[PDB]
């Protein structure tokens, strides 16, 4: 019997036309030297956050963490990114990658990091990566020499204050990454939800081509959901002997999200998120299974293919 | 010697490109039965507002006020305008005109009164009436079936909260006026400043075509600056034997601005308004003089022509 949307693909049921972009959102006010939630795999573990009801006494294995060479953060200003790159260059002599996980169209107007925000940050929901990047390219270019309104989100994810300017310079994140001495790689993943099979296939192929000394700096809007997902996936790929529990604990304890089971709770206005949290918990487990069952033969079978013959259970 | 901009035309010095529109502003939240600052010329006089430092004991002549047949208000929802029309129909059997004094592009999206707001509300500054109305038509059409953000302005005259919707219906104010049983006449007057010689020439020519029993409902955004200026001008035209002081007092005391001399005191942020207030005071006197000198012969020469040979003094 037909299943319309399998586990891992719940977001496909949502209607993109209901979340179209309406404002240039300020992604970072540029006040700090670094982006928020900045963390590397070299960092010491800290106490787990109370909301996840984890075992504070637990001491996760650090097997492979010194060699892992990844980091994560929120969005950043160009200056903040140069600070990130200088900081990482101290840890490695390999190429440093800015891995941009944002599906939403974003860039820099007069050096100000902005994104084209629709409700739930789903302005590019349902678009292929090709379409998402075309929207981004067109929108950014159309802003040049035009008057724009750039605002942070306040009460209820609506604009609050902000500023108005006639734009004199437009840049993509790629341009800003390269100016900072980083290589650039884009995975257009949708905010709030599990990355698509497409997203993950693209990441995996990318991962297989990296030189051994590559450092991956993942980032999304806040450096939480999407950033932690790919940091976790990378940790599993590179350190397949480490237990799922150790992976989840250690990626949370250096400053990420915890992607295991926990007592979920939402303000009723945030109750749409609940099923996306469960979905992510299940898919993390399914990806761990993929890594275990496909690493012997060197990942001959792509995630998307394997997932269709080995579907996840709600 | 060459004067670049004569008195009455100061706003011509400003650069339109510095005030381009950036948001659909909510013009009325629709919560009251009537628009704000609603008043008719049949209304009782109230005590003057203290900020104008007037003589609270002075009683201006009411000569001609019963026959004047004018009103003013802020912008309105379609339902509010029907309440206005109903209220006015009780007072007259003549044609009731909606005299729209707004240069800013405005209309109704799903019945919601909005305007395309640039800084200082100068998004159509410098445009001819033809160009302003074209901008308006094009912007309104372009909104149909599109996602828009509609916000009230809060602190700093920047968007605060508001709403996002996909628009199923678009209307011009003319359509809304006619649906309420009102005739429609548009004068594209710039917010905050004295109406241009073009604006006034157009109004005077319109005035001369009116039947005796015509009722004029003037409105602008708040129903203060522009609305009162045209109410005052109409009062002078129709009641030319009444003293200038009496005109100014009585239009203020039924609920309009006071267009005579008063001690101006601005917030530091509002100091740009000071010379425009002073300009309006001088031009109101100059218009009174035009009426006194040209009424006997039936206005053979228009305001714009007379003003050029009788320039106002700063
Ligand atoms: O950008 P990444 O790093 O993926 O992180 C996201 C963003 O911070 C989201 O905020 P925004 O939507 O403003 O970008 C936030 O949603 P809320 O701010 O609605 O909580 C997500 O939390 P949850 O979706 O709640 O898990 C969080 O995982
Ligand atoms: O629309 P009309 O009826 O002409 O009245 C205007 C508007 O209310 C202006 O508000 P906005 O700019 O929000 O449309 C206001 O400026 P402020 O609200 O900035 O004071 C003007 O006051 P002054 O320009 O201050 O006289 C007032 O005369
Ligand atoms: Cl794709």
XYZ file of C-alpha atoms and ligand atoms in Angstrom:
685
model
C 0.000 0.000 0.000
C 1.182 3.475 -1.005
C 3.019 5.526 1.593
C 3.003 9.142 0.391
C 5.963 10.458 2.385
C 8.452 8.144 4.061
C 10.184 8.820 7.352
C 13.003 11.257 6.644
C 10.812 13.156 4.182
C 7.930 14.536 6.282
C 8.688 18.130 5.211
C 7.679 17.227 1.644
C 4.050 17.289 2.832
C 4.221 21.017 3.619
C 3.153 23.585 1.007
C 5.961 25.906 -0.122
C 3.541 28.578 -1.346
C 2.542 29.173 2.282
C 6.073 30.115 3.436
C 7.330 32.511 0.756
C 9.951 35.062 1.692
C 8.911 38.559 2.705
C 11.882 40.254 4.454
C 15.667 40.515 4.469
C 16.452 39.103 7.880
C 19.595 40.199 9.746
C 21.549 36.961 10.282
C 24.147 38.455 12.677
C 24.432 41.909 14.264
C 28.221 41.663 14.054
C 28.811 42.752 17.637
C 30.973 39.819 18.755
C 34.327 38.806 17.294
C 32.976 35.324 16.569
C 29.690 33.800 15.408
C 27.482 32.291 18.083
C 27.702 28.639 19.109
C 31.237 28.377 17.764
C 32.770 25.028 18.688
C 35.510 22.660 17.431
C 36.056 18.908 17.893
C 39.257 19.768 19.805
C 37.230 21.398 22.588
C 36.781 19.931 26.044
C 33.417 18.400 26.877
C 31.106 20.338 29.180
C 28.116 19.341 31.304
C 25.049 18.328 29.313
C 22.126 20.752 29.113
C 19.398 19.957 31.611
C 16.580 19.853 29.096
C 18.010 16.733 27.476
C 17.862 14.804 30.770
C 21.172 13.082 30.114
C 23.545 11.299 32.468
C 25.892 14.044 33.731
C 28.130 11.344 35.207
C 28.715 9.732 31.827
C 32.198 10.101 30.317
C 32.003 9.724 26.524
C 34.862 8.229 24.551
C 37.097 10.772 22.804
C 38.383 8.144 20.391
C 39.095 9.921 17.091
C 38.169 13.421 18.212
C 41.687 14.871 17.899
C 41.798 13.727 14.287
C 38.185 14.630 13.496
C 38.949 18.249 12.482
C 35.477 19.787 12.328
C 33.792 22.838 13.770
C 30.413 24.566 13.685
C 28.792 27.947 14.165
C 25.954 30.307 13.454
C 25.912 32.696 10.512
C 28.561 35.407 10.573
C 29.706 38.761 9.267
C 32.723 38.789 6.929
C 34.931 40.012 9.771
C 33.642 37.272 12.073
C 34.435 34.669 9.401
C 38.015 35.958 9.108
C 38.322 35.471 12.868
C 37.009 31.904 12.510
C 39.472 31.153 9.718
C 42.453 32.565 11.605
C 41.439 30.552 14.615
C 41.133 27.285 12.676
C 44.343 27.857 10.698
C 46.108 27.581 14.055
C 44.918 23.982 14.297
C 45.586 22.736 10.786
C 47.702 23.142 7.655
C 45.051 21.524 5.499
C 42.406 23.217 3.408
C 39.641 24.799 5.480
C 36.112 24.439 4.148
C 33.167 26.707 4.792
C 30.346 24.170 4.551
C 27.201 26.275 4.133
C 24.151 24.207 5.070
C 21.543 26.862 4.362
C 18.756 26.248 1.857
C 17.420 29.747 2.426
C 18.698 32.424 0.040
C 21.350 34.478 1.801
C 24.346 36.721 1.240
C 25.809 40.070 2.126
C 24.442 43.543 1.454
C 27.127 46.146 2.167
C 28.902 43.476 4.260
C 25.758 42.796 6.305
C 24.790 39.104 6.521
C 21.168 38.704 5.470
C 18.735 36.031 4.413
C 15.409 36.133 2.569
C 13.105 35.004 5.333
C 9.721 33.376 4.922
C 7.671 31.889 7.751
C 9.494 29.090 9.528
C 12.482 30.119 7.383
C 10.977 28.019 4.591
C 11.312 30.519 1.722
C 13.037 27.920 -0.482
C 11.114 24.882 0.810
C 10.776 22.229 -1.889
C 13.214 23.792 -4.358
C 16.052 21.779 -5.868
C 19.457 23.081 -4.897
C 19.738 24.430 -8.445
C 16.492 26.426 -7.995
C 17.384 27.630 -4.494
C 20.741 28.968 -5.684
C 19.186 30.608 -8.738
C 16.674 32.425 -6.467
C 19.558 33.523 -4.239
C 21.670 34.759 -7.173
C 18.768 36.742 -8.680
C 17.603 38.222 -5.375
C 21.062 39.360 -4.354
C 21.820 40.954 -7.687
C 18.433 42.688 -7.751
C 19.299 44.327 -4.436
C 22.273 46.246 -5.881
C 21.598 50.023 -5.986
C 18.152 49.427 -4.549
C 16.624 50.495 -1.287
C 16.145 47.613 1.128
C 14.784 46.978 4.599
C 16.952 44.732 6.794
C 15.554 43.636 10.136
C 16.160 41.285 13.020
C 13.202 39.151 14.049
C 11.595 39.907 17.348
C 8.273 39.087 18.878
C 6.734 36.179 16.998
C 9.332 35.867 14.219
C 8.299 39.186 12.710
C 10.536 42.170 11.912
C 11.297 44.516 14.790
C 13.143 47.746 14.043
C 16.132 47.267 11.748
C 17.446 49.672 9.133
C 16.888 50.955 5.630
C 19.708 51.451 3.149
C 20.446 51.876 -0.525
C 22.794 48.999 -1.268
C 26.211 49.726 -2.812
C 27.723 46.234 -2.681
C 26.418 42.691 -2.968
C 28.302 39.447 -2.251
C 27.586 35.754 -2.082
C 28.827 33.720 0.829
C 31.168 31.984 -1.602
C 32.878 35.305 -2.294
C 33.091 36.024 1.422
C 34.440 32.538 2.189
C 37.149 32.828 -0.462
C 38.131 36.284 0.755
C 38.695 34.672 4.132
C 40.921 31.939 2.711
C 38.336 29.172 2.940
C 37.091 26.784 0.312
C 33.311 26.814 -0.074
C 30.760 24.058 -0.343
C 26.997 24.440 -0.292
C 24.390 21.969 0.908
C 20.934 23.502 0.674
C 19.296 22.031 3.775
C 15.920 23.216 5.039
C 15.720 24.835 8.491
C 14.095 22.748 11.319
C 14.022 19.375 9.584
C 16.093 16.312 8.747
C 18.351 16.886 5.734
C 16.962 15.317 2.557
C 18.436 12.231 0.843
C 19.586 14.666 -1.826
C 21.374 16.825 0.745
C 23.070 13.819 2.293
C 24.072 12.122 -1.003
C 25.731 15.390 -1.966
C 27.556 15.614 1.351
C 28.739 11.986 1.170
C 30.187 12.348 -2.329
C 31.886 15.556 -1.160
C 33.205 13.767 1.905
C 34.802 10.982 -0.179
C 36.873 13.543 -2.120
C 38.379 15.368 0.828
C 42.093 15.234 1.416
C 43.048 13.698 4.723
C 43.951 16.960 6.400
C 40.752 18.811 5.433
C 39.027 20.835 8.124
C 35.248 21.221 7.826
C 33.565 24.288 9.282
C 29.843 23.666 9.175
C 27.377 26.469 9.633
C 23.679 27.233 9.439
C 21.604 30.153 10.788
C 22.065 29.514 14.499
C 24.623 26.711 14.442
C 22.250 24.292 16.140
C 19.951 21.874 14.242
C 21.513 21.521 10.801
C 25.054 22.229 11.918
C 24.932 19.537 14.621
C 23.333 17.001 12.254
C 26.234 17.157 9.786
C 28.831 17.319 12.532
C 27.278 14.130 13.914
C 27.179 12.493 10.490
C 30.817 13.363 9.887
C 31.825 11.994 13.280
C 30.068 8.695 12.479
C 31.680 8.389 9.040
C 35.176 9.089 10.224
C 34.962 7.220 13.524
C 32.760 4.199 12.774
C 33.997 2.181 15.782
C 32.620 4.722 18.262
C 29.235 3.988 19.813
C 26.159 5.977 18.783
C 25.791 7.101 22.401
C 29.368 8.415 22.562
C 28.906 10.280 19.255
C 25.671 11.921 20.363
C 26.937 12.789 23.833
C 30.251 14.243 22.695
C 28.808 16.350 19.864
C 26.270 17.762 22.290
C 28.843 18.293 25.018
C 31.212 20.420 22.882
C 28.256 22.771 22.298
C 25.850 21.169 19.853
C 22.325 19.827 19.907
C 21.675 16.426 21.441
C 20.230 14.157 18.749
C 19.133 11.261 20.921
C 15.853 10.596 22.682
C 14.755 13.125 25.271
C 11.526 14.443 26.818
C 10.359 16.818 24.094
C 8.365 19.876 25.123
C 7.062 22.844 23.140
C 5.273 26.094 23.743
C 1.995 25.310 21.986
C 2.860 27.809 19.251
C 5.983 25.698 18.577
C 4.116 22.371 18.575
C 4.544 21.900 14.819
C 8.191 21.093 15.606
C 7.445 18.008 17.658
C 7.183 15.502 14.812
C 10.279 16.942 13.120
C 12.254 16.305 16.347
C 11.113 12.669 16.475
C 11.819 12.245 12.804
C 15.384 13.522 13.311
C 15.953 11.145 16.230
C 14.957 8.182 14.083
C 16.956 9.303 11.062
C 20.128 9.809 13.078
C 19.774 6.152 14.124
C 19.120 5.134 10.536
C 22.200 6.975 9.273
C 24.314 5.287 11.943
C 23.003 1.985 10.624
C 23.901 3.048 7.068
C 27.473 3.837 8.112
C 27.865 0.482 9.919
C 26.412 -1.595 7.085
C 28.119 0.125 4.144
C 31.567 1.005 5.250
C 33.173 -2.368 4.605
C 32.698 -2.035 0.824
C 33.528 1.678 0.811
C 29.984 3.054 0.423
C 29.231 1.571 -2.986
C 25.530 2.187 -2.311
C 24.403 5.814 -1.925
C 22.368 6.850 1.112
C 19.289 7.680 -0.956
C 19.304 4.263 -2.643
C 20.020 2.370 0.574
C 17.324 4.313 2.490
C 14.635 3.370 -0.008
C 15.339 -0.356 0.424
C 15.867 0.042 4.178
C 13.141 2.502 5.195
C 13.049 3.996 8.690
C 10.149 3.357 11.086
C 8.242 6.272 12.624
C 19.627 87.260 -8.229
C 18.740 83.599 -8.776
C 16.716 81.852 -6.086
C 16.992 78.070 -6.498
C 13.781 77.187 -4.615
C 11.316 79.898 -3.661
C 9.285 79.858 -0.447
C 6.465 77.338 -0.824
C 8.758 74.998 -2.761
C 11.423 74.073 -0.162
C 10.802 70.325 -0.433
C 12.098 70.456 -4.000
C 15.609 70.637 -2.527
C 15.269 67.152 -1.031
C 16.576 64.076 -2.869
C 13.845 61.538 -3.666
C 16.345 58.689 -3.975
C 17.035 59.004 -0.258
C 13.414 58.199 0.693
C 12.390 55.256 -1.472
C 9.596 52.974 -0.325
C 10.524 49.792 1.530
C 7.379 48.446 3.264
C 3.617 48.157 3.038
C 2.550 50.217 6.002
C -0.722 49.568 7.790
C -2.710 52.825 7.509
C -5.560 51.894 9.903
C -6.002 48.809 12.130
C -9.762 48.887 11.560
C -10.673 48.587 15.220
C -12.809 51.739 15.513
C -16.063 52.458 13.670
C -14.621 55.701 12.287
C -11.238 56.962 11.043
C -9.141 59.047 13.442
C -9.488 62.813 13.707
C -12.934 62.737 12.115
C -14.559 66.166 12.143
C -17.085 68.190 10.158
C -17.581 71.919 9.764
C -20.935 71.568 11.588
C -19.142 70.538 14.779
C -19.024 72.561 17.998
C -15.755 74.388 18.720
C -13.547 72.927 21.440
C -10.841 74.487 23.596
C -7.598 74.999 21.668
C -4.713 72.555 22.105
C -2.187 73.944 24.565
C 0.803 73.468 22.287
C -0.425 76.251 19.997
C -0.551 78.824 22.831
C -3.762 80.383 21.653
C -6.351 82.532 23.428
C -8.816 80.058 24.948
C -11.234 82.924 25.527
C -11.379 84.026 21.908
C -14.532 83.029 20.054
C -14.091 83.040 16.290
C -16.906 84.014 13.931
C -18.982 81.070 12.758
C -20.125 83.002 9.693
C -20.490 80.556 6.803
C -19.688 77.380 8.734
C -23.174 75.915 8.556
C -22.993 76.144 4.736
C -19.311 75.191 4.346
C -20.013 71.461 4.121
C -16.583 69.942 4.596
C -15.034 67.253 6.738
C -11.657 65.626 7.346
C -10.158 62.401 8.674
C -7.256 59.996 8.675
C -7.050 57.031 6.356
C -9.732 54.367 6.754
C -10.726 50.781 6.170
C -13.505 50.246 3.636
C -16.042 49.679 6.419
C -14.927 52.846 8.189
C -15.424 54.826 4.963
C -18.961 53.510 4.672
C -19.635 54.682 8.167
C -18.264 58.081 7.149
C -20.433 58.245 4.045
C -23.548 57.287 6.013
C -22.797 59.936 8.609
C -22.270 62.606 5.928
C -25.364 61.601 3.903
C -27.395 62.557 6.975
C -26.186 66.112 6.528
C -26.622 66.570 2.820
C -28.350 65.466 -0.374
C -25.510 66.710 -2.544
C -22.678 64.687 -3.981
C -20.166 63.603 -1.337
C -16.552 63.587 -2.541
C -13.687 61.568 -1.127
C -10.838 64.050 -1.670
C -7.706 61.932 -1.341
C -4.714 64.189 -0.618
C -2.030 61.489 -0.499
C 0.950 61.535 -2.827
C 2.165 58.241 -1.343
C 1.075 55.112 -3.215
C -1.774 53.460 -1.342
C -4.752 51.166 -1.692
C -6.268 48.046 -0.202
C -4.929 44.502 -0.040
C -7.634 42.042 1.040
C -9.515 45.101 2.316
C -6.604 46.284 4.417
C -5.596 49.926 3.914
C -1.888 50.101 3.186
C 0.618 52.526 1.774
C 4.079 52.031 0.294
C 6.186 53.753 2.896
C 9.611 55.267 2.457
C 11.384 57.360 5.069
C 9.422 60.482 6.048
C 6.621 58.984 3.923
C 8.396 60.454 0.894
C 8.365 57.410 -1.399
C 6.805 59.403 -4.241
C 8.660 62.652 -3.526
C 9.396 64.571 -6.717
C 7.100 62.500 -8.946
C 4.439 64.169 -11.051
C 0.911 63.207 -10.110
C 0.860 61.052 -13.237
C 4.047 59.217 -12.183
C 2.868 58.764 -8.593
C -0.453 57.297 -9.699
C 1.277 54.977 -12.180
C 3.627 53.746 -9.441
C 0.585 53.113 -7.260
C -1.348 51.153 -9.891
C 1.699 49.035 -10.754
C 2.595 48.257 -7.143
C -0.976 47.317 -6.238
C -1.390 45.023 -9.232
C 1.972 43.393 -8.564
C 0.765 42.432 -5.089
C -2.156 40.304 -6.282
C -1.505 36.610 -5.552
C 1.829 37.479 -3.968
C 3.060 37.153 -0.399
C 3.295 40.569 1.285
C 4.376 41.886 4.681
C 2.087 44.548 6.214
C 3.302 46.326 9.329
C 2.372 49.237 11.524
C 5.284 51.575 12.157
C 6.455 51.686 15.733
C 9.534 53.160 17.331
C 11.814 55.069 14.968
C 9.122 54.879 12.276
C 10.228 51.321 11.546
C 8.040 48.232 11.107
C 6.984 46.518 14.301
C 5.227 43.164 14.171
C 2.425 43.105 11.615
C 1.428 40.235 9.372
C 2.252 38.225 6.307
C -0.353 37.141 3.803
C -0.899 36.050 0.226
C -3.153 38.657 -1.318
C -6.349 37.515 -3.028
C -7.762 40.985 -3.717
C -6.406 44.395 -4.648
C -8.334 47.692 -4.742
C -7.550 51.355 -5.329
C -9.030 53.960 -3.052
C -11.179 55.177 -5.933
C -12.857 51.766 -6.110
C -13.416 51.773 -2.358
C -14.789 55.341 -2.404
C -17.217 54.567 -5.195
C -18.365 51.395 -3.395
C -19.233 53.600 -0.430
C -21.274 55.919 -2.665
C -18.731 58.721 -2.796
C -17.257 60.601 -5.717
C -13.457 60.521 -5.877
C -10.837 63.178 -6.498
C -7.105 62.755 -6.000
C -4.537 65.435 -5.212
C -1.062 63.964 -4.796
C 0.273 66.067 -1.906
C 3.543 65.230 -0.210
C 3.385 64.424 3.507
C 4.760 67.053 5.977
C 5.013 69.967 3.571
C 3.058 72.786 1.978
C 1.108 71.554 -1.085
C 2.757 72.481 -4.406
C 1.495 75.116 -6.825
C 0.472 72.235 -9.067
C -1.510 70.638 -6.182
C -3.323 73.881 -5.420
C -3.992 74.859 -9.074
C -5.565 71.413 -9.467
C -7.698 71.833 -6.353
C -8.917 75.308 -7.322
C -9.925 74.175 -10.821
C -11.799 71.277 -9.182
C -13.437 73.599 -6.689
C -14.814 75.786 -9.504
C -16.590 72.785 -11.053
C -18.472 71.833 -7.861
C -22.237 72.068 -7.495
C -23.498 74.245 -4.673
C -24.490 71.292 -2.484
C -21.213 69.378 -2.857
C -19.745 68.011 0.391
C -15.981 67.556 0.504
C -14.468 64.911 2.746
C -10.749 65.523 2.842
C -8.334 62.931 4.108
C -4.660 62.199 4.324
C -2.776 59.634 6.428
C -3.498 61.048 9.876
C -5.973 63.741 8.861
C -3.756 66.467 10.310
C -1.273 68.380 8.123
C -2.564 68.001 4.573
C -6.215 67.559 5.493
C -6.282 70.769 7.546
C -4.436 72.790 4.891
C -7.126 72.036 2.298
C -9.968 72.521 4.777
C -8.508 75.935 5.588
C -8.118 76.789 1.912
C -11.712 75.749 1.218
C -12.955 77.858 4.140
C -11.111 80.935 2.776
C -12.432 80.360 -0.729
C -16.018 79.891 0.316
C -16.064 82.440 3.139
C -13.748 85.223 1.933
C -15.198 87.866 4.304
C -14.087 85.935 7.416
C -10.834 87.065 9.049
C -7.745 84.909 8.602
C -7.520 84.558 12.381
C -11.103 83.305 12.581
C -10.505 80.762 9.795
C -7.370 79.405 11.466
C -8.973 79.287 14.924
C -12.190 77.636 13.832
C -10.512 74.954 11.691
C -8.279 74.142 14.615
C -11.048 74.082 17.172
C -13.235 71.602 15.254
C -10.240 69.240 15.404
C -7.616 70.240 12.840
C -4.092 71.594 12.963
C -3.553 75.267 13.771
C -1.974 76.980 10.759
C -1.062 80.301 12.360
C 2.103 81.324 14.207
C 2.997 79.441 17.339
C 6.149 78.630 19.323
C 7.567 75.572 17.615
C 9.293 72.977 19.743
C 10.639 69.790 18.180
C 12.266 66.649 19.460
C 15.917 66.576 18.353
C 14.950 63.900 15.828
C 12.153 66.081 14.403
C 14.165 69.259 13.808
C 13.952 68.690 10.059
C 10.247 69.607 10.375
C 10.828 73.091 11.730
C 11.436 74.942 8.467
C 8.476 73.146 6.859
C 6.179 74.393 9.661
C 7.458 77.932 9.209
C 6.956 77.573 5.435
C 3.314 76.520 5.857
C 2.534 79.489 8.120
C 3.892 81.931 5.528
C 2.130 80.173 2.637
C -1.252 80.073 4.405
C -1.024 83.873 4.643
C 0.030 84.041 1.024
C -2.989 81.943 -0.065
C -5.314 84.188 1.949
C -3.860 87.142 0.051
C -4.406 85.360 -3.273
C -8.068 84.836 -2.422
C -8.557 88.453 -1.323
C -6.917 89.916 -4.445
C -8.375 87.583 -7.078
C -11.893 86.733 -6.004
C -13.521 89.911 -7.312
C -12.593 89.041 -10.911
C -13.442 85.329 -10.674
C -9.863 84.010 -10.502
C -8.834 84.916 -14.068
C -5.248 84.091 -13.051
C -4.359 80.875 -11.224
C -2.451 80.496 -7.955
C 0.745 79.208 -9.562
C 1.007 82.240 -11.864
C 0.142 84.787 -9.187
C 2.550 83.239 -6.707
C 5.450 83.624 -9.152
C 4.832 87.352 -9.512
C 3.981 87.710 -5.816
C 6.617 85.508 -4.181
C 6.245 84.794 -0.467
C 8.909 85.917 2.028
C 10.763 83.416 4.191
O 19.814 27.264 11.712
P 20.067 25.996 12.490
O 21.464 25.908 13.038
O 19.608 24.740 11.821
O 19.202 26.119 13.836
C 17.796 26.295 13.888
C 17.424 27.777 13.935
O 18.045 28.390 15.053
C 15.926 27.985 14.108
O 15.635 29.378 14.225
P 15.119 30.231 12.953
O 13.903 29.477 12.473
O 14.790 31.579 13.545
O 16.289 30.224 11.987
C 15.412 27.251 15.343
O 13.990 27.365 15.389
P 13.197 28.234 16.497
O 13.957 29.534 16.625
O 11.836 28.382 15.860
O 13.248 27.365 17.731
C 15.788 25.773 15.272
O 15.312 25.090 16.428
P 14.034 24.102 16.344
O 13.502 24.157 14.935
O 13.097 24.709 17.358
O 14.601 22.747 16.687
C 17.295 25.592 15.141
O 17.605 24.202 15.088
O -0.857 62.644 6.818
P -1.250 64.030 7.257
O -2.709 64.149 7.614
O -0.748 65.145 6.374
O -0.540 64.276 8.684
C 0.842 64.090 8.937
C 1.131 62.642 9.334
O 0.389 62.280 10.496
C 2.603 62.449 9.663
O 2.819 61.095 10.082
P 3.500 59.997 9.095
O 4.826 60.608 8.698
O 3.632 58.767 9.959
O 2.530 59.851 7.944
C 3.053 63.444 10.739
O 4.469 63.373 10.917
P 5.138 62.716 12.232
O 4.235 61.561 12.623
O 6.493 62.301 11.702
O 5.118 63.839 13.241
C 2.716 64.890 10.369
O 3.105 65.763 11.431
P 4.359 66.780 11.265
O 5.051 66.474 9.959
O 5.201 66.457 12.473
O 3.718 68.144 11.279
C 1.234 65.053 10.050
O 0.982 66.409 9.665
Cl 18.683 19.005 -5.438
